[PDB]
Amino acid sequence: TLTIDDGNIEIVGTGVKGKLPTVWLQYGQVNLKASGGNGKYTWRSANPAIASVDASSGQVTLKEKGTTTISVISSDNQTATYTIATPNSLIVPNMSKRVTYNDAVNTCKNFGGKLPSSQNELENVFKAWGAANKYEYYKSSQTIISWVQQTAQDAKSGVASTYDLVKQNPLNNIKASESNAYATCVK
């Protein structure tokens, strides 16, 4: 008798459960609600070789390997299977210290992903994660500024656009420095 809930899904994001969108927010962990049955039940999530899973709550945590294997058997010996292959998008910010477009691009794109089309892509991508504006989350970075495309006018200023989500929104003219925010990796 295996019964799992699929209305509240916990996405690799920051532990948010609602509808499955298309992006992961954080290391790489998701949790689904599935419960065994009467006796022997088997749980597998992303596979132990790559992720740590919670057997009393479909909790899968992956962060580097390739695909994720998740299966669920009812305590009565029923069989369920779910493997990550197409979906499972992941965003990765690269900049433990202030960074430049080229230094971060080598690292971010080295991830096989690409940069956002504009400042809003990151702010909207992060605002969807709930970190760009979690208030207390600022404690991880009171001010988080990302590198953005420059404007025709600011480019001539010899600068690029800078985005600050929790410190004041996006800003323009940043490049004369050579590393004022960081690179973002999506997908």
mmCIF file with all atom_site columns, C-alpha atoms in Angstrom, residues 70-181:
data_model
loop_
_atom_site.group_PDB
_atom_site.id
_atom_site.type_symbol
_atom_site.label_atom_id
_atom_site.label_alt_id
_atom_site.label_comp_id
_atom_site.label_asym_id
_atom_site.label_entity_id
_atom_site.label_seq_id
_atom_site.pdbx_PDB_ins_code
_atom_site.Cartn_x
_atom_site.Cartn_y
_atom_site.Cartn_z
_atom_site.occupancy
_atom_site.B_iso_or_equiv
_atom_site.pdbx_formal_charge
_atom_site.auth_seq_id
_atom_site.auth_comp_id
_atom_site.auth_asym_id
_atom_site.auth_atom_id
_atom_site.pdbx_PDB_model_num
ATOM 1   C CA . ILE A 1 70  ? 14.631 7.962  -7.588  1.00 0.00 ? 70  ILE A CA 1
ATOM 2   C CA . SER A 1 71  ? 12.435 4.908  -6.994  1.00 0.00 ? 71  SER A CA 1
ATOM 3   C CA . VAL A 1 72  ? 9.911  3.936  -4.310  1.00 0.00 ? 72  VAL A CA 1
ATOM 4   C CA . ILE A 1 73  ? 8.724  0.491  -3.202  1.00 0.00 ? 73  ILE A CA 1
ATOM 5   C CA . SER A 1 74  ? 5.700  0.023  -0.916  1.00 0.00 ? 74  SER A CA 1
ATOM 6   C CA . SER A 1 75  ? 6.426  -1.675 2.411   1.00 0.00 ? 75  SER A CA 1
ATOM 7   C CA . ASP A 1 76  ? 4.246  -4.453 0.989   1.00 0.00 ? 76  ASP A CA 1
ATOM 8   C CA . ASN A 1 77  ? 6.775  -4.899 -1.880  1.00 0.00 ? 77  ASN A CA 1
ATOM 9   C CA . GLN A 1 78  ? 5.189  -2.662 -4.557  1.00 0.00 ? 78  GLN A CA 1
ATOM 10  C CA . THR A 1 79  ? 7.514  -0.970 -7.109  1.00 0.00 ? 79  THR A CA 1
ATOM 11  C CA . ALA A 1 80  ? 7.807  2.692  -8.192  1.00 0.00 ? 80  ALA A CA 1
ATOM 12  C CA . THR A 1 81  ? 10.439 4.390  -10.389 1.00 0.00 ? 81  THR A CA 1
ATOM 13  C CA . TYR A 1 82  ? 11.327 8.041  -11.103 1.00 0.00 ? 82  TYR A CA 1
ATOM 14  C CA . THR A 1 83  ? 14.623 9.127  -12.717 1.00 0.00 ? 83  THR A CA 1
ATOM 15  C CA . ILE A 1 84  ? 15.840 12.662 -13.486 1.00 0.00 ? 84  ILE A CA 1
ATOM 16  C CA . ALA A 1 85  ? 16.777 12.939 -17.185 1.00 0.00 ? 85  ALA A CA 1
ATOM 17  C CA . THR A 1 86  ? 15.261 15.902 -19.074 1.00 0.00 ? 86  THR A CA 1
ATOM 18  C CA . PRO A 1 87  ? 13.979 18.252 -16.351 1.00 0.00 ? 87  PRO A CA 1
ATOM 19  C CA . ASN A 1 88  ? 16.085 19.156 -13.285 1.00 0.00 ? 88  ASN A CA 1
ATOM 20  C CA . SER A 1 89  ? 17.526 22.562 -14.204 1.00 0.00 ? 89  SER A CA 1
ATOM 21  C CA . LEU A 1 90  ? 20.307 24.041 -12.042 1.00 0.00 ? 90  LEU A CA 1
ATOM 22  C CA . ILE A 1 91  ? 21.475 27.637 -11.516 1.00 0.00 ? 91  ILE A CA 1
ATOM 23  C CA . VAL A 1 92  ? 24.993 28.218 -10.130 1.00 0.00 ? 92  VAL A CA 1
ATOM 24  C CA . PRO A 1 93  ? 26.451 31.554 -9.085  1.00 0.00 ? 93  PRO A CA 1
ATOM 25  C CA . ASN A 1 94  ? 30.275 31.674 -9.315  1.00 0.00 ? 94  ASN A CA 1
ATOM 26  C CA . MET A 1 95  ? 31.942 34.330 -7.178  1.00 0.00 ? 95  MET A CA 1
ATOM 27  C CA . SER A 1 96  ? 32.955 33.648 -3.600  1.00 0.00 ? 96  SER A CA 1
ATOM 28  C CA . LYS A 1 97  ? 34.829 36.953 -4.011  1.00 0.00 ? 97  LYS A CA 1
ATOM 29  C CA . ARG A 1 98  ? 33.992 39.942 -6.288  1.00 0.00 ? 98  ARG A CA 1
ATOM 30  C CA . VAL A 1 99  ? 34.584 38.826 -9.915  1.00 0.00 ? 99  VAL A CA 1
ATOM 31  C CA . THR A 1 100 ? 34.927 40.007 -13.531 1.00 0.00 ? 100 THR A CA 1
ATOM 32  C CA . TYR A 1 101 ? 32.991 39.000 -16.659 1.00 0.00 ? 101 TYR A CA 1
ATOM 33  C CA . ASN A 1 102 ? 35.872 37.042 -18.243 1.00 0.00 ? 102 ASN A CA 1
ATOM 34  C CA . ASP A 1 103 ? 37.201 35.298 -15.112 1.00 0.00 ? 103 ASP A CA 1
ATOM 35  C CA . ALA A 1 104 ? 33.703 34.230 -14.042 1.00 0.00 ? 104 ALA A CA 1
ATOM 36  C CA . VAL A 1 105 ? 32.597 33.420 -17.611 1.00 0.00 ? 105 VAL A CA 1
ATOM 37  C CA . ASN A 1 106 ? 35.424 30.876 -17.968 1.00 0.00 ? 106 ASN A CA 1
ATOM 38  C CA . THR A 1 107 ? 34.182 29.197 -14.775 1.00 0.00 ? 107 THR A CA 1
ATOM 39  C CA . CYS A 1 108 ? 30.423 29.653 -15.264 1.00 0.00 ? 108 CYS A CA 1
ATOM 40  C CA . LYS A 1 109 ? 30.299 28.510 -18.895 1.00 0.00 ? 109 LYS A CA 1
ATOM 41  C CA . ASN A 1 110 ? 32.865 25.814 -18.046 1.00 0.00 ? 110 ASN A CA 1
ATOM 42  C CA . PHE A 1 111 ? 29.818 24.356 -16.316 1.00 0.00 ? 111 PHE A CA 1
ATOM 43  C CA . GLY A 1 112 ? 28.178 23.744 -19.718 1.00 0.00 ? 112 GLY A CA 1
ATOM 44  C CA . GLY A 1 113 ? 25.513 26.399 -19.008 1.00 0.00 ? 113 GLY A CA 1
ATOM 45  C CA . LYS A 1 114 ? 25.082 29.930 -20.393 1.00 0.00 ? 114 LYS A CA 1
ATOM 46  C CA . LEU A 1 115 ? 24.657 33.470 -19.004 1.00 0.00 ? 115 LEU A CA 1
ATOM 47  C CA . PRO A 1 116 ? 21.306 35.215 -18.556 1.00 0.00 ? 116 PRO A CA 1
ATOM 48  C CA . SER A 1 117 ? 20.004 37.480 -21.355 1.00 0.00 ? 117 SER A CA 1
ATOM 49  C CA . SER A 1 118 ? 19.742 40.548 -19.066 1.00 0.00 ? 118 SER A CA 1
ATOM 50  C CA . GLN A 1 119 ? 19.768 41.920 -15.489 1.00 0.00 ? 119 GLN A CA 1
ATOM 51  C CA . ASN A 1 120 ? 16.127 40.842 -14.944 1.00 0.00 ? 120 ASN A CA 1
ATOM 52  C CA . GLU A 1 121 ? 16.964 37.245 -15.880 1.00 0.00 ? 121 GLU A CA 1
ATOM 53  C CA . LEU A 1 122 ? 19.075 36.951 -12.705 1.00 0.00 ? 122 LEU A CA 1
ATOM 54  C CA . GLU A 1 123 ? 16.896 39.143 -10.466 1.00 0.00 ? 123 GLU A CA 1
ATOM 55  C CA . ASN A 1 124 ? 13.765 37.349 -11.682 1.00 0.00 ? 124 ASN A CA 1
ATOM 56  C CA . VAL A 1 125 ? 15.594 34.010 -11.505 1.00 0.00 ? 125 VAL A CA 1
ATOM 57  C CA . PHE A 1 126 ? 16.844 34.719 -7.960  1.00 0.00 ? 126 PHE A CA 1
ATOM 58  C CA . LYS A 1 127 ? 13.581 36.390 -6.851  1.00 0.00 ? 127 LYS A CA 1
ATOM 59  C CA . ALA A 1 128 ? 11.921 33.131 -7.925  1.00 0.00 ? 128 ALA A CA 1
ATOM 60  C CA . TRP A 1 129 ? 14.370 31.310 -5.606  1.00 0.00 ? 129 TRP A CA 1
ATOM 61  C CA . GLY A 1 130 ? 13.520 33.613 -2.674  1.00 0.00 ? 130 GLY A CA 1
ATOM 62  C CA . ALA A 1 131 ? 17.183 34.383 -1.834  1.00 0.00 ? 131 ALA A CA 1
ATOM 63  C CA . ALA A 1 132 ? 17.566 37.687 -3.703  1.00 0.00 ? 132 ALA A CA 1
ATOM 64  C CA . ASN A 1 133 ? 14.985 39.001 -1.221  1.00 0.00 ? 133 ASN A CA 1
ATOM 65  C CA . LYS A 1 134 ? 14.726 36.826 1.904   1.00 0.00 ? 134 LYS A CA 1
ATOM 66  C CA . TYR A 1 135 ? 15.745 39.664 4.269   1.00 0.00 ? 135 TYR A CA 1
ATOM 67  C CA . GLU A 1 136 ? 17.565 37.454 6.787   1.00 0.00 ? 136 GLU A CA 1
ATOM 68  C CA . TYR A 1 137 ? 19.140 35.561 3.886   1.00 0.00 ? 137 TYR A CA 1
ATOM 69  C CA . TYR A 1 138 ? 21.078 38.799 3.362   1.00 0.00 ? 138 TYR A CA 1
ATOM 70  C CA . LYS A 1 139 ? 23.233 37.567 6.262   1.00 0.00 ? 139 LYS A CA 1
ATOM 71  C CA . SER A 1 140 ? 24.877 35.390 3.572   1.00 0.00 ? 140 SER A CA 1
ATOM 72  C CA . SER A 1 141 ? 25.612 38.595 1.663   1.00 0.00 ? 141 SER A CA 1
ATOM 73  C CA . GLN A 1 142 ? 23.949 41.772 3.007   1.00 0.00 ? 142 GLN A CA 1
ATOM 74  C CA . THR A 1 143 ? 24.423 43.016 -0.566  1.00 0.00 ? 143 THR A CA 1
ATOM 75  C CA . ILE A 1 144 ? 24.536 40.650 -3.564  1.00 0.00 ? 144 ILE A CA 1
ATOM 76  C CA . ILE A 1 145 ? 25.517 42.398 -6.818  1.00 0.00 ? 145 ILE A CA 1
ATOM 77  C CA . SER A 1 146 ? 25.771 40.497 -10.144 1.00 0.00 ? 146 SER A CA 1
ATOM 78  C CA . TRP A 1 147 ? 27.547 41.487 -13.416 1.00 0.00 ? 147 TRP A CA 1
ATOM 79  C CA . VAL A 1 148 ? 25.082 42.770 -16.018 1.00 0.00 ? 148 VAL A CA 1
ATOM 80  C CA . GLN A 1 149 ? 25.180 43.825 -19.667 1.00 0.00 ? 149 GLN A CA 1
ATOM 81  C CA . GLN A 1 150 ? 26.215 47.492 -20.013 1.00 0.00 ? 150 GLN A CA 1
ATOM 82  C CA . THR A 1 151 ? 24.214 50.231 -21.752 1.00 0.00 ? 151 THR A CA 1
ATOM 83  C CA . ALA A 1 152 ? 25.313 52.244 -24.794 1.00 0.00 ? 152 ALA A CA 1
ATOM 84  C CA . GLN A 1 153 ? 25.942 55.246 -22.521 1.00 0.00 ? 153 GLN A CA 1
ATOM 85  C CA . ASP A 1 154 ? 27.536 53.443 -19.547 1.00 0.00 ? 154 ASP A CA 1
ATOM 86  C CA . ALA A 1 155 ? 29.663 51.242 -21.809 1.00 0.00 ? 155 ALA A CA 1
ATOM 87  C CA . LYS A 1 156 ? 31.312 54.482 -22.996 1.00 0.00 ? 156 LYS A CA 1
ATOM 88  C CA . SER A 1 157 ? 31.726 55.236 -19.321 1.00 0.00 ? 157 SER A CA 1
ATOM 89  C CA . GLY A 1 158 ? 33.964 52.182 -19.633 1.00 0.00 ? 158 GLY A CA 1
ATOM 90  C CA . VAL A 1 159 ? 31.630 50.228 -17.354 1.00 0.00 ? 159 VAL A CA 1
ATOM 91  C CA . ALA A 1 160 ? 29.004 47.433 -17.411 1.00 0.00 ? 160 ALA A CA 1
ATOM 92  C CA . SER A 1 161 ? 25.623 47.198 -15.610 1.00 0.00 ? 161 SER A CA 1
ATOM 93  C CA . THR A 1 162 ? 25.740 45.840 -12.065 1.00 0.00 ? 162 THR A CA 1
ATOM 94  C CA . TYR A 1 163 ? 22.759 44.233 -10.353 1.00 0.00 ? 163 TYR A CA 1
ATOM 95  C CA . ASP A 1 164 ? 22.239 44.411 -6.604  1.00 0.00 ? 164 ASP A CA 1
ATOM 96  C CA . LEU A 1 165 ? 19.211 42.417 -5.473  1.00 0.00 ? 165 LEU A CA 1
ATOM 97  C CA . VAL A 1 166 ? 19.185 42.695 -1.671  1.00 0.00 ? 166 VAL A CA 1
ATOM 98  C CA . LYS A 1 167 ? 21.267 45.880 -1.389  1.00 0.00 ? 167 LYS A CA 1
ATOM 99  C CA . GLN A 1 168 ? 19.260 48.253 -3.664  1.00 0.00 ? 168 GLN A CA 1
ATOM 100 C CA . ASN A 1 169 ? 18.268 46.660 -7.048  1.00 0.00 ? 169 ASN A CA 1
ATOM 101 C CA . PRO A 1 170 ? 20.386 46.794 -10.229 1.00 0.00 ? 170 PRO A CA 1
ATOM 102 C CA . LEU A 1 171 ? 22.967 49.549 -10.934 1.00 0.00 ? 171 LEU A CA 1
ATOM 103 C CA . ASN A 1 172 ? 24.719 50.850 -14.056 1.00 0.00 ? 172 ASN A CA 1
ATOM 104 C CA . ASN A 1 173 ? 28.414 51.505 -14.744 1.00 0.00 ? 173 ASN A CA 1
ATOM 105 C CA . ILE A 1 174 ? 30.663 48.758 -13.365 1.00 0.00 ? 174 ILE A CA 1
ATOM 106 C CA . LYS A 1 175 ? 33.704 47.361 -15.195 1.00 0.00 ? 175 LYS A CA 1
ATOM 107 C CA . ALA A 1 176 ? 36.285 50.104 -14.700 1.00 0.00 ? 176 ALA A CA 1
ATOM 108 C CA . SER A 1 177 ? 37.100 47.950 -11.666 1.00 0.00 ? 177 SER A CA 1
ATOM 109 C CA . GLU A 1 178 ? 37.396 44.537 -13.411 1.00 0.00 ? 178 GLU A CA 1
ATOM 110 C CA . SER A 1 179 ? 35.262 42.238 -11.170 1.00 0.00 ? 179 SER A CA 1
ATOM 111 C CA . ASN A 1 180 ? 32.374 44.013 -9.427  1.00 0.00 ? 180 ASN A CA 1
ATOM 112 C CA . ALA A 1 181 ? 29.799 41.233 -9.117  1.00 0.00 ? 181 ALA A CA 1
#
